[PDB]
Amino acid sequence: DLAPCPHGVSLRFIYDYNMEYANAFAKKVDCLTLLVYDENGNYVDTRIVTGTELQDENYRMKLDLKQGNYHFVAYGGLACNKSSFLMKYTPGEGTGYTDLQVELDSECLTNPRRKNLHGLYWGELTLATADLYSEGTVEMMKNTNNIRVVLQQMNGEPVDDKKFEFEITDDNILFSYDNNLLENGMVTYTPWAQGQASAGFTDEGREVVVAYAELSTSRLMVRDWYSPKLTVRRKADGVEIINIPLINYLLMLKSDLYASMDSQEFLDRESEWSMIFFLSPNLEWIKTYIKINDWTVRIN
Numbered sequence: 092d093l094a095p096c097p098h099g100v101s102l103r104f105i106y107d108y109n110m111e112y113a114n115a116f117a118k119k120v121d122c123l124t125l126l127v128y129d130e131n132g133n134y135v136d137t138r139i140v141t142g143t144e145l146q147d148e149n150y151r152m153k154l155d156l157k158q159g160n161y162h163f164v165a166y167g168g169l170a171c172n173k174s175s176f177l178m179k180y181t182p183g184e185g186t187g188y189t190d191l192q193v194e195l196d197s198e199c200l201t202n203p204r205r206k207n208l209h210g211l212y213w214g215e216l217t218l219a220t221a222d223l224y225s226e227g228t229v230e231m232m233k234n235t236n237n238i239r240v241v242l243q244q245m246n247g248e249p250v251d252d253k254k255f256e257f258e259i260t261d262d263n264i265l266f267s268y269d270n271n272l273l274e275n276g277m278v279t280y281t282p283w284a285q286g287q288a289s290a291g292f293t294d295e296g297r298e299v300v301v302a303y304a305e306l307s308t309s310r311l312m313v314r315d316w317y318s319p320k321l322t323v324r325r326k327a328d329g330v331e332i333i334n335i336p337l338i339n340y341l342l343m344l345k346s347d348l349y350a351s352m353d354s355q356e357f358l359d360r361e362s363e364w365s366m367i368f369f370l371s372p373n374l375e376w377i378k379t380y381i382k383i384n385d386w387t388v389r390i391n
C-alpha cells in the first residue's frame with residue numbers, strides 16, 4: 092500500500108421535519124451548501140452540491156479530514172441560480188461558525204417573477220472523525236412558507252380578487268448562525284399569484300367563486316419583538332377588512348388538532364398554509380369562523 096487508513100466523516104442529509112414526519116430531501120433539496128468548522132468554531136472548508144446525485148436517497152458526502160471533532164452546517168436552496176437568499180458576512184468580522192448570516196435578496200419582495208421564494212433549508216451537526224469515515228446525519232428544516240388566503244362569500248355570491256390588496260408584514264428576512272431571526276426592519280410581502288377559484292356549487296346550481304392570493308414568506312416564529320400581520324384591504328375605499336396577528340391565528344389550528352406539539356415546531360414543520368375568510372354581501376369579514384388548512388376554527 093501507500094498511505095495510512097483514510098480518515099474523516101460521511102454525511103447523510105435528511106429533511107423529515109415536516110407534517111408527514113418523512114424524508115423529502117431527495118425531492119425538495121436541489122442544491123446543498125455544506126460548511127466545515129473546527130471544535131473552536133473556525134472556518135475549515137465549504138462543499139457545494141448542485142447535481143442529480145441529491146435526488147439519490149443513498150447519497151452521502153465523503154469528507155477527508157484531519158483527526159478531530161467538527162461542526163457542520165448545511166444549507167439547502169442557497170447554491171443554485173434559483174436561490175432567493177444570500178450568505179452575508181460582516182466586513183471586518185470573521186468567517187467562523189458564529190459570524191454567518193443569511194438574508195433574503197430584497198429583489199424577491201418586488202420582482203413579480205421572483206416573489207415565489209425558492210425553498211430555504213437548514214441543519215447542523217457536531218461529529219468526530221473516524222478511520223474509514225464516521226457516519227452522521229444532518230437533519231434539516233424548511234425556513235420558507237406558502238400562505239394561500241381565500242375570500243369566500245357566506246351566501247355563495249362571487250368575490251372579485253381585483254377588488255383587494257393582500258399583504259403580510261413581518262421582520263423575518265435576516266437569519267443568525269443558529270437559524271434564529273435577527274431584527275432587521277419590517278418587510279411587506281405581496282402575492283406571487285392572485286385570482287379567482289371554484290368552491291363548488293350551491294343547491295340552486297350556482298357556482299361559488301372565491302378570491303385567492305398566494306404569498307411566499309421567510310420563517311414564521313413566535314418571538315416577543317415582532318408580531319407578523321396578515322392584511323386584506325379593499326382597493327376602492329382603502330378599508331382593511333382583515334388585519335390579524337397571523338401567527339396567533341395559525342396557532343388556533345395547532346391548539347385544536349396538535350395541542351401537544353410545540354408552537355415553533357408546528358410553524359416549522361408546516362410550510363403549506365391555507366386560510367379561508369368568509370365575507371358578508373357588503374364584503375366585510377364575518378369574524379366568527381375561518382378555515383385553516385381545511386379545518387374550521389372558531390376565532391373568539
Ligand SMILES: [Mg+2]
Pocket residue numbers: 121122168169170171172173174209
Ligand atoms: Mg436550488
Ligand SMILES: [Mg+2]
Pocket residue numbers: 233234235236311357358359360361362363
Ligand atoms: Mg413553516
